[PDB]
Design a protein around this ligand. Structure first.
Ligand SMILES: Cc1ccc2sc([C@@H](C3=C(O)[C@](C)(c4ccccc4)C3=O)c3ccccc3)c(C)c2c1
Ligand SMILES: [Zn+2]
Length: 223
């Protein structure tokens, strides 16, 4: 998160910190959010050979009793996810066991477009600048929902599939390490962080989760 503030600790109890493991390079990191006690929603580009989920975190470098480190038993990457266009960048992670509900850990379901100009909030442990490491503490930032023409330069952006997020006048933005984190508008999840420019200039592209709620429900019911 660039240009944000430290979250009040444990004030976003659905947030998930993901470590993405692959066979041929070191760990990478993503966000996500708990939508059922045994399912986390995140981005498809965060898929790996294995993933570990930490719930209940604030400072991710300091173990505490609120942490729940949970095993992922299966990744459900959207069947139409396209590595070239980045369309359908959404994935469900099934946890081995149901998380414990605590003050610091709870679910965020979302029900069945928010107009541009509205302000929304996104949180994450991602990089705080182009040349900066991920934040040790959960950060959050208020971003403007944009008209889709603001993201035209992402040639594979599509308004019905995706949200365009972050006024280009500001440096405020989601960034690397924040993928999969939820965008909340008036307390309701509307998007997840998908991608943006390597130089961090907003807007960034978020998956429009409304479009995917039927698919999410089909995975939840079958599993
Ligand atoms: C402004 C703005 C906001 C969010 C974003 S995520 C993003 C970038 C990205 C990475 O690099 C990682 C940290 C990543 C990659 C693979 C596995 C796990 C983690 C990630 O996320 C991206 C790459 C490949 C596909 C989609 C996104 C960039 C450049 C970016 C930029
Ligand atoms: Zn704590």
């Amino acid at each position: 998160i660039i240009g944000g503030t430290e979250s009040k600790p444990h004030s976003r109890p659905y947030m998930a910190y993901l470590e993405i493991v692959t066979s041929n390079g070191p760990s990478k990191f993503c966000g996500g959010f708990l939508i059922r006690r045994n399912f986390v929603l995140t981005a498809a580009h965060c898929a790996g050979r294995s993933i570990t989920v930490t719930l209940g975190a604030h400072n991710i470098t300091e173990e505490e009793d609120t942490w729940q480190k949970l095993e992922v038993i299966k990744q459900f990457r959207h069947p139409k996810y396209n590595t070239s266009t980045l369309h359908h960048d959404i994935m469900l992670l099934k946890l081995k066991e149901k998380a414990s509900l605590t003050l610091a850990v709870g679910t965020l379901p979302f029900p069945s477009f928010v107009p541009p100009g509205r302000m929304c909030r996104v949180a994450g442990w991602g990089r705080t600048g182009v040349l900066k490491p991920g934040s040790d503490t959960l950060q959050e930032v208020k971003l403007r929902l944009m008209d889709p023409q603001a993201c035209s330069h992402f040639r594979d952006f599509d308004h019905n599939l995706q949200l365009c997020v972050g006024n280009p006048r500001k440096t405020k933005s989601a960034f690397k390490g924040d993928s999969g984190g939820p965008l909340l508008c008036a307390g309701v999840a509307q998007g997840i962080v998908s991608y943006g420019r390597s130089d961090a200039k907003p807007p960034a592209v978020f998956t429009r989760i409304s479009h995917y709620r039927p698919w999410i429900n089909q995975i939840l019911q079958a599993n």
